[model samples]
Target chain A: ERVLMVDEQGSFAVGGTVLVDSLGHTFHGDHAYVFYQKPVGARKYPLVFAHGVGQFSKTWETTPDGREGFQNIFLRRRFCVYLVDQPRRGNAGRGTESVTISPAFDEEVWFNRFRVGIWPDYFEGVQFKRDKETLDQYFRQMTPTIGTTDFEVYSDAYAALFDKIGPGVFITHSQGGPVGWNTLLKTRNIKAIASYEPGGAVPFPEGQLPEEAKFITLSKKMEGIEVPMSVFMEYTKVPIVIYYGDNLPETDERPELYEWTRRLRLMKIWAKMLNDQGGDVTVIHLPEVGLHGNTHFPMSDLNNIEVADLLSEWLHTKALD
Target chain B: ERVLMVDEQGSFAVGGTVLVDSLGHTFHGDHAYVFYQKPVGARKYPLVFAHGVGQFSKTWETTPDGREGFQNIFLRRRFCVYLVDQPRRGNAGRGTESVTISPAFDEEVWFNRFRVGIWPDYFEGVQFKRDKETLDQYFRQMTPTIGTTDFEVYSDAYAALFDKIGPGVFITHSQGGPVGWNTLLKTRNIKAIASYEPGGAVPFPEGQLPEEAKFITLSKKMEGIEVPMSVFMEYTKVPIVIYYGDNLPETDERPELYEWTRRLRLMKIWAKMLNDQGGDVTVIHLPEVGLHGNTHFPMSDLNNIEVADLLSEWLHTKALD
Candidate 1:
């Protein structure tokens, strides 16, 4: 397959290795490298790829064979894909201990902490241990943490990324779906979204629909990065396509058990919210794959090759303007 | 079909009428009467019939069917059935509302006003309706009013009466379940509870469950006169039989919505908590009936005849001592 690199300046090189940093503005972080996949030919669209929890740019960038991920394969196939890493996760690298979470009380704490942009020191001020009782506390506390975190940091960062890369499309996995929507709350310029197995969206929306679906757009300033209720209000109308792994639901025994898969659960919440808001959200609940961590590479986890092809074809067929 | 009067000393005279006086211990401002069916044989256990929200002592005495409610049916069979009105409802006068309740606003209103106490007069200083959100607020502001007017108050009030009646099995319906349980929490007395489709038993012992399961409890409480968390902790390993009309589960679009029926949904949470604490909670979920509220009003509401009968058999067969 032929690979092509599209730079921000309407120039393209179809061949060997091209300078990655030559394209859009980039942020250098300790954990992962950030880059913009400029358009090839006369393409006017820029797509952003947001990873799920504990994932990074490498999420969709690799196949099961330990080779280049699908996004890398897609880049060769001429689809614009931006790589986004979840906070305190792949590429963002704040250290696992940095975001140690409690499944119980962290909701209020994380919201307060994240609003201030202070990385939560511990999960609801509770320490992690192997004891069952302590873990129970963590799960209960973890409930509000996921909701709070999205409203705070990850969403803010995505807004910054939106400014760096123009709004074209969003392909998010798991927690990234929530964080991506959080970013969409502000910018209102993205064309469409395709998220897989993202959860955490629940108590479905109830009320009137928004004036228009807000797709985040790129801007020079980081206005979208701020915490504002307006952002939440506007983002509610954004259209979303969700791919959820129905088989991999977290064990019902633990309240905080879904903490690791917060995004997957949140997606259900968001879908419900959207449905309540009179917006149609098509959630493709996938029962074929039973994987808690299958957000990014759902295609790779397919039991059959045809399933991967079917999903790829489906992912590419987004609602167009 | 025959109603018998029982004096304050647990003695019931067949076809006798006991007129209550203002000076009587069981009497408040209004005239109250106790109609009881003395246990036919040795009393194996005492199962008290607590009334519904805002209902009067008449809730139990006045049978909708002209046959009998739970009290008459159980009393003649074997269990000693006590029909006592909760204070502030029916014959029970008002108490001081002095409980500290957190209001809705963070400003001067610390808690919602309704959170002050279930019986406002009983806790005079208690704030009610600080916010309409939490059960504490509802308990303080709303429940008392409902108990005073609705049969639920008479049911909950029976818990306080337990001080005189001594420890026994509590069979409360709807909001009375929480009120009775809350009363138990305060006194630390009482043994076993079988809440018949009581509303507002939302509090779960620490552990995590799905948002759907959690929201099921919350939504039911919001729509119905539910028991409060203050009483939910009173849930014991005692066998609880809950009834829900399964006549039309297909109505709920989500198949999981069936969990909301009886102990199916709530038991998942309760049983999970008991399992966490290493206790056995036998929940007999009756799906045969439709949603049965506290009062026999809206006759279409399916009453758990099976639950009522089984409970009668259990109380009659089991030795309390």
Candidate 2:
């Protein structure tokens, strides 16, 4: 029952070499690593996954608590899945710019920012299992970038991947949101986007950029970006689905809620603008959808199966399956 | 016929953080990435595959011309396989030290070094398919190290993987040979080793370190290293098989032969030294065994099926399958 029959599975890299390196070797930077598997009875369009900051394709491979991850779940439905490691991260970490990775103790900070819990405490009805081992696996899976993270660089590489693989569904999370948006400027191969909690990356047309909004109790903040009109038009051609999880403050004014609230508001604005432009943008709050208890990483939360099913159902409705 | 059914598969990282880095992030260096697949009815022990210098686990995934690589070949036989991207390369690219990657035009240099038909021409009877696409794919797969190459660092991370995965057979290539040997010092979980053309990185006992030998037409070269007697004894506990591919000159004394000849001589010395210490080791030259037309990377050669069968036959003889 657990067997996954794959027709072909392997990995490839996209993007050309930047220049010659210090070792008299070709500096193979500006590239993204793509690990792909075409299932035995694969569907029409593939799903390309791009992970968030500090994470790689490992995010889609397995949950922290050792559950079957989204990669396998989609494959079970016979979708050719392409898991990408953007430039300067994970397998695609080689880059031209120099970077120094920090090893600070930021786990608790992430726990709060990720809306998993308020540090050392899980929110009531949280989907993440309360355990040390799972947390350790979660922390250990975080990798460092080889260079400064630039959405333009990520977009170029991702666009190169799309050029190679042709049109496909692009899935983004957290930091990848902007990159996916930026990629539309370079390639039209992306047919759709399934963005999971794009905490701070919402692209708007330059002249129509959303005004900066204040946090509930913090300094003024905004997560959206202004892009060229030509680049903005690309978003109108594709359908986009955005998902946000629970523990986000809708009314309670906790300090930790400021970041999420700001980003959520920006996301709302992004959806409204796209809708006005005749773009198909569906923004769903899991709590409001009767699917609650999800953290920032809903796709890997304890109830990930339910999350994948929801996504699958939406794709089928859009005739993407 | 091309379908591969797997029981379970996922990726994990080994080794701990060095310290805090520049971005208040965990400096997650000295770690290795392990992508594994346990097939249905997998055998008793797993096979951990490691690639050589300038390469990643992709070396075992597929060939330059899109052929099935050794990983799937072994998995088809029902053996669990763990493909490793050694420290500071590929997915395990986070590192403690900083190193500049020079983007020099060294493709031809590597072409010569990897013995894949020097420069713009293929050696007669060479295994590699000559074409622009194949060569492009071949060169593009070469990834730079995230940090300076250190056998100790590689060994520590690889050893950590062994600690987590427990005892399994280690299959290593050029640079990984030394790392695998160095790893024996840190862990005893390795039950056997199948090393592919370990060009240099041959470890010798401190008291019995081999004298530096002269390369045919180059500077004096010796590819052996000195190790503690305790670490040296670990070799005696396991069986090892070494494979060297074709295009290696025996007495022609060409400049290109200098590197391979030097490495081959050192390999012989390594085997002799280990055998003298009661270690069971077998070294085979592909041509001598009636398997000719192979290049440095026999595992991904055009005739890789034949090569895999040879390795499979050897493993079965040792009762590893």
| lDDT of candidate 2 over A1-321, digit per residue (tens) | 578898998877787555755665554466788889899988999999999888889889888888888888998889999998888777676566656653446667778878888877889999998997687677767767777767778888889888888888999998788787888778878888899987545667777776743222332335666678877777878889988888888655666655666677777777888789888988898989789899989989999999998899889888888
* lDDT of residue B320 for candidate 1: 49
Candidate 1 positional error at A223, Å: 80
lDDT of 2 by residue, B57-99 (tens): 8889878888889888888889999998887787776566656
Q: CA shift at A59, candidate 2, in angstroms?
A: 1.6
Encode model 1's per-residue lDDT on B1-321: one tens digit a residue: 232222111211011112233444111121122323344352545666665553433344323222234554454455666655454322222211212211112211211111122221212322111232222211111111201233333333354455545667776655665665565554434666766555554455334433434443433432222444434445554444443333213344432233234334555566566555644455544423322222222111124344455555555454442
Model 1 clash count equals 112
| Worst window of 10 by summed lDDT in candidate 1 chain B | B8-17
- Evaluated against the true chain A, what TM-score does chain A of model 2 have? 0.92
Candidate 2 ranges beyond 4 A from true positions: A17-27, A98-105, A199-201, A212-222, A228-231, A250-257, B17-29, B98-105, B212-222, B228-231, B250-257
For each candidate, give its TM-score against the true structure.
Answer: 0.33, 0.90
State the DockQ of every prediction. 0.00, 0.41
The segments of candidate 1 whose C-alpha lies over 4 angstroms from its true place after superposition are A1-321, B1-37, B40-44, B93-157, B206-210, B216-237, B251-264, B287-307, B316-321
| lDDT of residue A312 for candidate 1 | 54
